[PDB]
Design an enzyme around this catalytic site. Structure first.
Site, PDB file in Angstrom:
ATOM      1  N   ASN A  29       1.065  -1.301   0.093  1.00  0.00           N
ATOM      2  CA  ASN A  29      -0.153   0.153  -0.143  1.00  0.00           C
ATOM      3  C   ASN A  29       0.833   1.141  -0.015  1.00  0.00           C
ATOM      4  O   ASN A  29       1.777   1.186   0.670  1.00  0.00           O
ATOM      5  CB  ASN A  29      -1.048   0.047   1.138  1.00  0.00           C
ATOM      6  CG  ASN A  29      -1.507  -1.114   1.478  1.00  0.00           C
ATOM      7  OD1 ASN A  29      -2.508  -1.764   0.720  1.00  0.00           O
ATOM      8  ND2 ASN A  29      -1.303  -1.989   2.457  1.00  0.00           N
ATOM      9  N   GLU A  85       8.602  -4.801  -1.171  1.00  0.00           N
ATOM     10  CA  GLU A  85       7.560  -3.830  -1.102  1.00  0.00           C
ATOM     11  C   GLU A  85       7.822  -2.576  -1.370  1.00  0.00           C
ATOM     12  O   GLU A  85       7.010  -1.863  -2.082  1.00  0.00           O
ATOM     13  CB  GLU A  85       6.827  -3.870   0.286  1.00  0.00           C
ATOM     14  CG  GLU A  85       6.429  -5.291   0.835  1.00  0.00           C
ATOM     15  CD  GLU A  85       5.535  -6.189  -0.077  1.00  0.00           C
ATOM     16  OE1 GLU A  85       5.593  -7.594  -0.060  1.00  0.00           O
ATOM     17  OE2 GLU A  85       5.122  -5.867  -1.112  1.00  0.00           O
TER      18      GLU A  85
HETATM   19 ZN   LIG Z   1       5.045  -7.670  -4.720  1.00  0.00          ZN
END
Ligand SMILES: [Zn+2]
Ligand SMILES: *[C@@H]1O[C@H](CO)[C@@H](O[C@@H]2O[C@H](CO)[C@@H](O[C@@H]3O[C@H](CO)[C@@H](O)[C@H](O)[C@H]3NC(C)=O)[C@H](O)[C@H]2NC(C)=O)[C@H](O)[C@H]1NC(C)=O
Ligand SMILES: *[C@@H]1O[C@H](CO)[C@@H](O[C@@H]2O[C@H](CO)[C@@H](O[C@@H]3O[C@H](CO)[C@@H](O)[C@H](O)[C@H]3NC(C)=O)[C@H](O)[C@H]2NC(C)=O)[C@H](O)[C@H]1NC(C)=O
Ligand SMILES: *[C@@H]1O[C@H](CO)[C@@H](O[C@@H]2O[C@H](CO)[C@@H](O[C@@H]3O[C@H](CO)[C@@H](O)[C@H](O)[C@H]3NC(C)=O)[C@H](O)[C@H]2NC(C)=O)[C@H](O)[C@H]1NC(C)=O
Ligand SMILES: *[C@@H]1O[C@H](CO)[C@@H](O[C@@H]2O[C@H](CO)[C@@H](O)[C@H](O)[C@H]2NC(C)=O)[C@H](O)[C@H]1NC(C)=O
Ligand SMILES: *[C@@H]1O[C@H](CO)[C@@H](O[C@@H]2O[C@H](CO)[C@@H](O)[C@H](O)[C@H]2NC(C)=O)[C@H](O)[C@H]1NC(C)=O
Ligand SMILES: *[C@@H]1O[C@H](CO)[C@@H](O[C@@H]2O[C@H](CO)[C@@H](O)[C@H](O)[C@H]2NC(C)=O)[C@H](O)[C@H]1NC(C)=O
Ligand SMILES: *[C@@H]1O[C@H](CO)[C@@H](O[C@@H]2O[C@H](CO)[C@@H](O)[C@H](O)[C@H]2NC(C)=O)[C@H](O)[C@H]1NC(C)=O
Ligand SMILES: *[C@@H]1O[C@H](CO)[C@@H](O[C@@H]2O[C@H](CO)[C@@H](O)[C@H](O)[C@H]2NC(C)=O)[C@H](O)[C@H]1NC(C)=O
Ligand SMILES: *[C@@H]1O[C@H](CO)[C@@H](O[C@@H]2O[C@H](CO)[C@@H](O)[C@H](O)[C@H]2NC(C)=O)[C@H](O)[C@H]1NC(C)=O
Ligand SMILES: *[C@@H]1O[C@H](CO)[C@@H](O)[C@H](O)[C@H]1NC(C)=O
Ligand SMILES: *[C@@H]1O[C@H](CO)[C@@H](O)[C@H](O)[C@H]1NC(C)=O
Lengths: 11, 902
Positions: B289, B322
């Protein structure tokens, strides 16, 4: 979603 | 003519501009035990083409809006048609607003709704997560929109290309912290209707996709750093985890990783801040996110006192993965889920690059080979595989979207992108990558857009020359499944490619536009010296002098396994390779020393070399100090152990492995100063871990002596554990194996009092190593007691017992007798009947065992098999394959081990 993967894997 | 609200893809008639969303989780249940959240939203959208219907996503939301489910207004001085009716269409997850007239091209409209949903413990949309702090059950609210669940939190045009800005407000208890993608606008203010609640507004997001939104309400605390460029970095966790310092490693590496990527991408980090949060039991693992990345606790937190080096490696790589997305995926977003492989594949590759930057002495980039390349080749060497690419029109439903998230997408994606960067050179790859990100920032792409920008970079230079366009080359790796075996005849330099399948009898029925021929980048080393690079074109057979040898020379292909293929040679060349490794292994790069082992065992499986040639390839290991080649051997031989550890084959196998690993054990014995201090770098620590594991499990007296001494020391002083976290799994297991109920009861006590999951895991696993039947049976008797063994840990523990050669019959008897537990555990948590069946039947390799698996199946009348149904069919099929394999290999393998164990 997060995947690095565990470092083995072999067939 | 089908109605648009019955189609899974949204119309393109209306495009969102911006949303206001206010969410209010109620973290106290409503007395019947229901947790809810309430929300209010306004979406501003533009009409592109005239239409008398608004179709927007909505999932599991109840509307409380005054009048119809929405209120519709014109922006500025635009008029708005009257609403006819609003309806929810559950199948395609739509809210449908039928209008009395048509919206008008060029006009903007605002649509307001009020709604509520369950704050369920279901890891989807806006949901609740329950955990413990001492005596108290805590409950937080958090999000997981990936892939199609933003619509479960508020009504939205929930497709990734339909980007907009978002103004998020959270209404929350005043002593809790509210987080979202962006910083809070200022201090929280009391809610007028009830000042026990506060209101936190967040700054407007950049233009972005719904699936990347996040908002969290919790008691979490943080550790922080402000980067030189003002970017605030925070790691969030449970107050107790922060207080113990478990967020520090994550904090340590985040700054360097963000810095690496900004440079790598030639693009500034696109947000004012970076939050990363460790959630207890976040089953999705991690989610990228934008500005608020979520992780399961054990993926982000690190305890230096109890965590092994492999935990450290997991943290730095998961973070790098990430954070990679904060540009690739979030700033530039793939237009549709059929291209998910590019996003996840790209992050799965560059995670190694980012992590290498934070830990430059670890040689982390090498780990993609065992971790992803050979891992995915296992499943991509099957007739049942699939191409990286899927037609967009085949991916429609949320279920079809979920299917995109697999081994092929992540690991083969990473493998082919790594191959691509390698044949372009990293410098050239980065130029095209930067061009792509700059051109498409805050917009959407397909994989063809990346290829085009890489082509622009190739076309702007003269040094790197390709046999075809980037697109044409990559088409071979993305439009068809599988990969080639490259076979070299070094007498002639003849070179061939064919579609590689592990099962030489398999029928491929998926057709390829290319007849399973690839355009293959082929590096090579001859007698330790790099040769000119070569491209195998789209032909079955070619010839080049690069691959032709003299009698005493050798050639080896695919340096560092940068290419997504495996290599076979004539026997003569194999022997020359073997000879080189025997006399001076330094001549061949460590990754290729591993490759020789990986490939040959696969080739043996495929009946392309005899199994003895693959075993011959392990002979050099007595002089091997490095991690990867030893890992290759152990990975390749675990099946041999599994098939043979109850047979006459096992004695010679144990003895052979003792012979091979004894010098390595000796090496580390001296290096580590009698085991008192670990090797410095990651690879050497991994090698020591595997060396001690292999020595002890194969019965090297010196390792058995080490394990007994340390565990004795621990039992003499329980509060001061003398065993380094790296060695705990082996030392614990071997010591319990040597001992009886005194070692067992001690470890049981330690497990019961264990505050930390990873240590609890090691203890649970080691308790299964007992060689006492009565202990393993008593232990099985605990696995169903939730006071002693967590439900979520039950099948794992039974599997660990099954893994013990002595525990094998005990666990199998246990699973059969207590299969009458499907109606107690298909509703009381999942359990995973599938993984339990596979683990316990893993060893089955005889007709007699097949008969028992069939006889057990004869309880088809009621109770069934559940989510382990057809995993039971997989077990029957695998047993047949094992029977056939053992029959073919037993004699040849027995004699090889006897011969080579002195
Ligand atoms: Zn990923
Ligand atoms: C999405 O949320 C935004 C943030 O709340 C809304 O923007 C805010 O609108 C408020 C009024 O609707 C403004 O607050 C003040 O309200 C008084 C009412 O008495 C007005 O006179 C003032 O104009 C205003 N105060 C000031 C100092 O201007 C906020 O100014 C305004 N916030 C902004 C622009 O950042 C959006 O209206 C809302 N979107 C929709 C479509 O409703
Ligand atoms: C969204 O609206 C749904 C439909 O109105 C709600 O689902 C319903 O919840 C009702 C109340 O919880 C249930 O009806 C009855 O409720 C009373 C009082 O709680 C109980 O005594 C009854 O046992 C119960 N009846 C039954 C048959 O269980 C319904 O179960 C249920 N109705 C339907 C059609 O699903 C959602 O709760 C609501 N969600 C939110 C978040 O507000
Ligand atoms: C996050 O980064 C921090 C700064 O780089 C690290 O802080 C280092 O912790 C090390 C391990 O605790 C310290 O090393 C040595 O600790 C022993 C035990 O007390 C002492 O004998 C040594 O004196 C000491 N180091 C030296 C160089 O003599 C470091 O002192 C310390 N480094 C700094 C610059 O403060 C954190 O360890 C790191 N956190 C994690 C989880 O990796
Ligand atoms: C979300 O907040 C932003 C920032 O306050 C709003 O952006 C403003 O939008 C108005 C109306 O279109 C413009 O006149 C201003 O120029 C914008 N300000 C900035 C700084 O961009 C946005 O409208 C809000 N979203 C919604 C749905 O109301
Ligand atoms: C925030 O306030 C709430 C309510 O005052 C606290 O929740 C209570 O915590 C105590 C333990 O200290 C429990 O005995 C109660 O059951 C809780 N009440 C409810 C309604 O859940 C909470 O501890 C406070 N949190 C912080 C971080 O200050
Ligand atoms: C992105 O890359 C460009 C191009 O290499 C960088 O611009 C160069 O920066 C160096 C810094 O000393 C200069 O010597 C060059 O003259 C610059 N080249 C050009 C064409 O301007 C730029 O700094 C990078 N930008 C980001 C945000 O990382
Ligand atoms: C999806 O991405 C494309 C770009 O790949 C967007 O199309 C561009 O929109 C910008 C801004 O309005 C224009 O300047 C470009 O000329 C467009 N490029 C094209 C058409 O190739 C497109 O708007 C995005 N789709 C959605 C729904 O936002
Ligand atoms: C190497 O490849 C060549 C073909 O390029 C093979 O030699 C050919 O053998 C056929 C037999 O029918 C002859 O008709 C051709 O004239 C030969 N071509 C020549 C000599 O240039 C050769 O057998 C291959 N060797 C291998 C695979 O070991
Ligand atoms: C094959 O991989 C090895 C690493 O396993 C590469 O060796 C690195 O090379 C770079 C540049 O020469 C050095 O900065 C590193 O220190 C090297 N690492 C080690 C552990 O030796 C090697 O470059 C790769 N070979 C090829 C042809 O690309
Ligand atoms: C593949 O097809 C052939 C028929 O030519 C058949 O003999 C064989 O059983 C099939 N399947 C496998 C897995 O070999
Ligand atoms: C073996 O080869 C390596 C790498 O070329 C070299 O550095 C080393 O000196 C050689 N060792 C012996 C014993 O010949």
């Amino acid at each position: 979603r997060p995947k690095p993967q565990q470092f083995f894997g072999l067939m | 003519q089908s109605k648009p609200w019955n189609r899974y893809r949204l119309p393109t008639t209306l495009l969102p501009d911006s949303y206001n969303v206010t969410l209010r989780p109620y973290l106290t249940p409503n007395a019947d035990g229901l947790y809810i959240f309430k929300g209010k939203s306004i979406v501003r959208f533009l009409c592109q083409e005239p239409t008398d219907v608004i179709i927007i996503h909505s999932k599991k939301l109840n509307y409380t809006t005054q009048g119809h489910m929405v209120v519709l207004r014109g922006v500025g001085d635009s008029q708005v048609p009257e609403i006819d009716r609003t309806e929810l269409v559950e199948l395609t997850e739509y809210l449908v607003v039928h209008l009395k007239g048509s919206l008008q091209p060029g006009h903007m409209y605002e649509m307001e709704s009020e709604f509520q949903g369950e704050l369920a413990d279901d890891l989807a949309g806006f949901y609740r997560s329950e955990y413990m702090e001492g005596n108290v059950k805590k409950v937080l609210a958090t999000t997981q929109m990936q892939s199609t669940d933003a619509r479960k939190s508020f009504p939205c045009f929930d497709e990734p290309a339909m980007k907009a800005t978002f103004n998020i407000t959270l209404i929350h208890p005043n002593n809790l912290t509210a987080l979202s993608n962006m910083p809070p606008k200022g201090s929280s203010t009391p809610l007028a209707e009830d000042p026990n609640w506060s209101v936190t507004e967040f700054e407007t997001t950049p233009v972005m996709s719904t699936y990347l939104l996040a908002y969290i309400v919790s008691e979490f605390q943080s550790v922080n750093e402000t980067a030189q460029n003002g970017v605030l970095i925070r790691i969030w966790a449970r107050p107790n985890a922060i207080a113990e310092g478990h967020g520090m490693y994550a904090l340590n590496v985040t700054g360097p990783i963000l810095n690496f990527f900004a440079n790598h991408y030639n693009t500034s980090y696109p947000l004012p801040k970076s939050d990363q949060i460790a959630l207890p039991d976040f089953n999705a693992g991690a989610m990228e996110n934008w500005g608020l990345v979520t992780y399961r606790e054990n993926a982000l937190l690190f305890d230096p006192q109890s965590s092994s080096i492999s935990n450290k490696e997991r943290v730095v790589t998961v973070i790098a993965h990430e954070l990679a997305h904060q540009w690739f995926g979030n700033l530039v977003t793939l237009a549709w889920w059929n291209d998910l492989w590019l996003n996840e594949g790209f992050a799965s590759y560059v995670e190694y690059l980012g992590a290498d930057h934070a830990e430059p002495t670890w040689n982390l980039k090498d780990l993609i080979v065992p971790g992803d390349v050979y891992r995915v080749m296992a499943v991509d060497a099957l007739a049942s595989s699939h191409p990286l690419t899927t037609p967009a029109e085949e991916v429609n439903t949320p279920a079809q979207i979920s299917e995109m998230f697999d081994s092929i997408s992540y690991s083969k994606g990473a493998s082919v992108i790594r191959m691509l960067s390698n044949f372009l050179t990293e410098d050239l790859f980065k130029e095209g990558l930067a061009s792509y990100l700059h051109a498409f920032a805050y917009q959407n792409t397909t994989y063809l857009d990346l290829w085009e920008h890489l082509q622009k970079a190739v076309d702007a230079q003269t040094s790197i020359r390709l046999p075809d366009t980037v697109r044409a080359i990559m088409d071979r790796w993305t439009l068809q499944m599988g990969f080639p075996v490259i076979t070299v005849d070094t007498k002639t330099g003849n070179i061939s490619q064919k579609h590689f399948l592990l099962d030489s009898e398999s029928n491929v029925t998926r057709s390829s536009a290319f007849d399973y021929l690839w355009i293959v980048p082929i590096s090579s080393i001859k007698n330790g010296v790099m040769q000119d690079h070569y491209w195998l074109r789209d032909v079955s057979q070619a010839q080049n002098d690069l691959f032709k040898t003299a009698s005493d020379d050798w050639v080896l292909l695919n340096v560092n396994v940068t290419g997504y293929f495996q290599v076979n040679y004539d026997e003569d060349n194999w022997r020359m390779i073997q000879h080189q490794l025997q006399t001076n292994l330094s001549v061949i790069p460590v990754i290729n020393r591993a490759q020789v082992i990986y490939d040959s065992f696969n080739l043996a499986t495929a009946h392309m070399v005899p199994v003895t040639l693959a075993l011959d390839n392990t002979l050099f290991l007595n002089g091997e100090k490095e991690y990867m080649p030893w890992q290759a051997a152990l990975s390749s031989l675990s099946y041999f152990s599994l098939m043979f550890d109850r047979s006459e084959v096992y004695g010679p196998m144990k003895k052979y492995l003792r012979k091979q690993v004894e010098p390595l054990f000796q090496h580390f014995e001296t290096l580590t100063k009698n085991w008192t201090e670990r090797p410095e770098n990651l690879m050497d620590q991994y090698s020591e871990i595997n060396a001690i594991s292999t020595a002890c499990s194969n019965g090297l007296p010196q390792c058995e002596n080490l394990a007994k001494t340390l565990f004795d020391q621990w039992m003499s002083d329980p509060e001061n554990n003398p065993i380094h976290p790296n060695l705990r799994s082996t030392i614990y297991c071997n010591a319990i194996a040597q001992g009886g109920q005194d070692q067992w009861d001690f470890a049981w006590g330690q497990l019961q009092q264990a505050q930390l999951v990873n240590e609890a895991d090691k203890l649970r696993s080691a308790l299964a190593c007992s060689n006492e039947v009565w202990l393993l049976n008593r232990y099985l008797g605990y696995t169903l007691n939730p006071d002693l063994i967590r439900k979520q840990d039950a099948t794992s523990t039974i599997n660990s017992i099954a893994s013990n050669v002595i525990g094998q019959p005990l666990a199998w008897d246990f699973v059969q007798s207590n299969w009458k537990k499907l109606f107690q555990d298909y509703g009381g948590g999942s359990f995973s009947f599938s993984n339990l069946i596979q683990g316990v039947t893993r060893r089955f390799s005889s007709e007699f065992e097949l008969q028992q698996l069939e006889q057990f199946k004869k309880n088809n009348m009621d109770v069934g098999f559940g989510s382990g149904t057809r995993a039971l069919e997989q077990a029957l099929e695998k047993t047949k394959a094992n029977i056939k394999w053992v029959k073919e290999n037993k004699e040849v393998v027995l004699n090889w081990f006897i011969e080579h164990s002195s």
